[PDB]
Design a protein around this ligand. Sequence first.
Ligand SMILES: [Ca+2]
Ligand SMILES: [Ca+2]
Ligand SMILES: [Ca+2]
Ligand SMILES: [Ca+2]
Ligand SMILES: [Ca+2]
Ligand SMILES: [Ca+2]
Ligand SMILES: [Ca+2]
Ligand SMILES: [Ca+2]
Ligand SMILES: [Zn+2]
Lengths: 91, 98, 88, 88
Amino acid sequence: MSQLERNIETIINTFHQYSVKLGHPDTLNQGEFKELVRKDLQNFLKKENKNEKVIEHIMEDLDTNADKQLSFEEFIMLMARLTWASNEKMN
Amino acid sequence: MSQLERNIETIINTFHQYSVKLGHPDTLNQGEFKELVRKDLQNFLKKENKNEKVIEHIMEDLDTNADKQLSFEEFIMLMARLTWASNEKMNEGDEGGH
Amino acid sequence: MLTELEKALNSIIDVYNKYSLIKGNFNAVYRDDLKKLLETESPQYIRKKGADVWFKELDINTDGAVNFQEFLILVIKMGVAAHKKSCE
Amino acid sequence: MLTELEKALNSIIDVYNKYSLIKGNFNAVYRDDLKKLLETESPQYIRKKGADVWFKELDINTDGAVNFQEFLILVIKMGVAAHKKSCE
Ligand SMILES: [Ca+2]
Ligand SMILES: [Ca+2]
Ligand SMILES: [Ca+2]
Ligand SMILES: [Ca+2]
Ligand SMILES: [Ca+2]
Ligand SMILES: [Ca+2]
Ligand SMILES: [Ca+2]
Ligand SMILES: [Ca+2]
Ligand SMILES: [Zn+2]
């Protein structure tokens, strides 16, 4: 596996570590998403993590089928946005 | 012509207003791009317009074939990015004194 | 007061919301909404591609909707195409 | 120190720069650079699509380059496809 593939597998496995703990094993509910953001994005979303309202805005905006759950397909949009934002910050 | 088509026509017409002035008439050189940004993006790029080196860096990033001028194809990426940025700002909200 | 160019960019946001507010998530334009968007907002040479073909092209994360960022892909393509046509 | 997930995201940036730094605009990956990227970094089922097909899909403004944002389309699509394989 290449560097890129290993990075994608890290995303997949991180998502699954939370999506499996409750309900549908392949989607994140609002509580598991908040826990993921709080622990595994504690630096990239440091400011947002202090305002639960902002985190809920992020969830709702990613939940494109409006079922109050995040699929991986919905979730990966956040991954791409935060990668872009990291690059901007480092520059 | 739809609203969206008229908006796109405005982008194209603005690009051409400045691209024709110098050099190739269908590309923006640095001076043309800076004039466009200074006048027609004076609000959306207010802070960036205060540092001519920031505007330079925006152009260099868009000039993907490194020929020191922006084609319309290169330029339209900035339009999309500024539309996104405007959307982001309308959703955060504004801030008001002594 | 904003420039004409700035108002045009703001107007593009308004166009998206006309369709994203139809139903469901307000940052989602579903397949039938996109067909309606293309029929109303885009010229024949864009519509002819087919609304299903466009939807598959634009739904880059295959979550069943076109969010605002994905819609800006359509705006980019429409712009490039309109420029090529008016500046053949 | 960054989390493993945050480090993974920063590494995706590094993968892009490995190829964007080769020549020209260092925030651009050209057609041959993309072919190299696909051959080296992506799995067989992504490579199979072909580098020219991928390049045309990713180069949304048709300027002959894949910028970082355009590269992230590939990342999204690779992630969705890899997740599907992982669940199968
Ligand atoms: Ca779950
Ligand atoms: Ca959902
Ligand atoms: Ca010129
Ligand atoms: Ca150029
Ligand atoms: Ca909607
Ligand atoms: Ca989508
Ligand atoms: Ca390069
Ligand atoms: Ca491009
Ligand atoms: Zn022209």
